[PDB]
Amino acid sequence: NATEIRASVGKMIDGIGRFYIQMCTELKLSDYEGRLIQNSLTIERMVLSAFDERRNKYLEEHPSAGKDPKKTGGPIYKRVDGKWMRELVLYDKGEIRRIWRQANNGDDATAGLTHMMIWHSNLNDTTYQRTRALVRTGMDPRMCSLMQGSTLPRRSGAAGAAVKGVGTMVMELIRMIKRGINDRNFWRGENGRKTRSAYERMCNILKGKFQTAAQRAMMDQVRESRNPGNAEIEDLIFLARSALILRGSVAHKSCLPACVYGPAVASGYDFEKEGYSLVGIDPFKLLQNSQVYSLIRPNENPAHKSQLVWMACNSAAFEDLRVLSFIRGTKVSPRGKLSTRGVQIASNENMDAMESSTLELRSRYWAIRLPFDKPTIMAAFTGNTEGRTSDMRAEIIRMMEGAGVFELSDEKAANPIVPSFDMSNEGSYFFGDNAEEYD
Structure with a gap:
C-alpha cells in the first residue's frame, strides 16, 4: 500500500525518537543539551557503534590503544551558567543494543540505524571536501559534485548504494582494480569470486544510475572485462566526466538528526499512526516546528552553520544553489563563502571559548x-583525445556537446509556485570550495 509504507517508515522514526529520549535521561542531559546537535551526533554514533561491533558497516571508528572493545562512547557536552564542558562517556555496547531494541518494541529495527547512517553521510557531504581523496585516486578534483555518499562506511550494504553518486561508485570500482593489479590473489580462489560478484553488482549498480543507453552499454564492457586493469580505469574516468553533463539519477533522502525526532515524539506525535515520508512536506514541517541548538566557535557565523545543517537535513548539497535559495527564501551560498566549520568538535579544542546558538x-x-x-564543462570535456577512442565513447561525447515548489500552507501540492532564480549567484555549492577535507 501507499499508507502502510508510511506506517512502517513512521514506526522507524518513533524508535529513533524513543531511543533518543531514553538516552537523554540515562546521560542526565538538560532539555537544551538534549536538543544540542553535537550531543545528538554522539548519541547517534554510539548506537551505530553498538551494533557495528567493528564491522565498519554502520560507521567507521579509529582504533585507540587500551580501549575496551566491548564498550562504546563519545564526547557529551553539558552546560552550567553558560559554560560548556566536554565529558567523555563509556557504555557497554550490549546495553546500548538493549535500549535501542526496547525503544523499538523489541525488534532490531536496523532500518532506523541505516537512517541515521545516511544523515551522517549527508552531513559529511555538506561539511567536508573530498578533493584530495579524488586526486589521490587519479580522478579530477572537479568531480566533487558527483561524490554523494562517499563517506559511507566501507562495508555499507545496498542501503547506501541508493544514495551513492556516480563519482562515488566510480572511485570504489577504481580502487578495487588498483589492488587487483597489485595483488595476484585478488581475483583468485573463492576469495576472488568473492570479490568478482561484488565487482559485478557494483558495476550494475552504477549502470543503473546512468540514464543514457550509451553510458550503460560501456559499463557493460567494464563489468564483463574478465580481468580489469588500467584500461577499464580509463573508461570509468571517462564515464565520470560524462556524468558531469549527462548526469545520472541518484537518491536524495531527507534524514534528520535524532534531536529532531526525539522532542517530536515527546510532543505526543505518533509517527506510526499519522505516517511519515522522507519525500514531501513532513520533513519540512518537522524542521519548521523544530528547535535545535549548536555549539559555535569564536567568529563562526551562526547563520552559515545553520545553512550547512539545513542543507544536510534535506540532502541538497549537490543541488543548484539558485533553486534552493528560492525555496529557502534566503541566499544559500557556496561552501567557500561560509564563515564556519564543521559541527563536530575535535578533541583538541578549547571548550571554555564555546558558545551556543539556535539553528x-x-x-x-x-x-x-x-x-x-565553467569548471564542470572544462572537466567534462578534458577527454582523452590523447588516446583511446571508441564505439560509444564518441556517441556519448556527441550527447554531451548537445546538452515543483509549494507553500507550507499548500499541504499536498495544489498551487505550485513557478520559481524565480537570480542568475547573479553561483549554482554549485562547491564553487571556490574552502572546506576541510574528510579525515
Whole structure:
C-alpha cells in the first residue's frame, strides 16, 4: 500500500525518537543539551557503534590503544551558567543494543540505524571536501559534485548504494582494480569470486544510475572485462566526466538528526499512526516546528552553520544553489563563502571559548522528488583525445556537446509556485570550495 509504507517508515522514526529520549535521561542531559546537535551526533554514533561491533558497516571508528572493545562512547557536552564542558562517556555496547531494541518494541529495527547512517553521510557531504581523496585516486578534483555518499562506511550494504553518486561508485570500482593489479590473489580462489560478484553488482549498480543507453552499454564492457586493469580505469574516468553533463539519477533522502525526532515524539506525535515520508512536506514541517541548538566557535557565523545543517537535513548539497535559495527564501551560498566549520568538535579544542546558538533550519516553501559551471564543462570535456577512442565513447561525447515548489500552507501540492532564480549567484555549492577535507 501507499499508507502502510508510511506506517512502517513512521514506526522507524518513533524508535529513533524513543531511543533518543531514553538516552537523554540515562546521560542526565538538560532539555537544551538534549536538543544540542553535537550531543545528538554522539548519541547517534554510539548506537551505530553498538551494533557495528567493528564491522565498519554502520560507521567507521579509529582504533585507540587500551580501549575496551566491548564498550562504546563519545564526547557529551553539558552546560552550567553558560559554560560548556566536554565529558567523555563509556557504555557497554550490549546495553546500548538493549535500549535501542526496547525503544523499538523489541525488534532490531536496523532500518532506523541505516537512517541515521545516511544523515551522517549527508552531513559529511555538506561539511567536508573530498578533493584530495579524488586526486589521490587519479580522478579530477572537479568531480566533487558527483561524490554523494562517499563517506559511507566501507562495508555499507545496498542501503547506501541508493544514495551513492556516480563519482562515488566510480572511485570504489577504481580502487578495487588498483589492488587487483597489485595483488595476484585478488581475483583468485573463492576469495576472488568473492570479490568478482561484488565487482559485478557494483558495476550494475552504477549502470543503473546512468540514464543514457550509451553510458550503460560501456559499463557493460567494464563489468564483463574478465580481468580489469588500467584500461577499464580509463573508461570509468571517462564515464565520470560524462556524468558531469549527462548526469545520472541518484537518491536524495531527507534524514534528520535524532534531536529532531526525539522532542517530536515527546510532543505526543505518533509517527506510526499519522505516517511519515522522507519525500514531501513532513520533513519540512518537522524542521519548521523544530528547535535545535549548536555549539559555535569564536567568529563562526551562526547563520552559515545553520545553512550547512539545513542543507544536510534535506540532502541538497549537490543541488543548484539558485533553486534552493528560492525555496529557502534566503541566499544559500557556496561552501567557500561560509564563515564556519564543521559541527563536530575535535578533541583538541578549547571548550571554555564555546558558545551556543539556535539553528535556523526553517524554509519558506517545500519541494518534492540553468547553465553548467565553467569548471564542470572544462572537466567534462578534458577527454582523452590523447588516446583511446571508441564505439560509444564518441556517441556519448556527441550527447554531451548537445546538452515543483509549494507553500507550507499548500499541504499536498495544489498551487505550485513557478520559481524565480537570480542568475547573479553561483549554482554549485562547491564553487571556490574552502572546506576541510574528510579525515
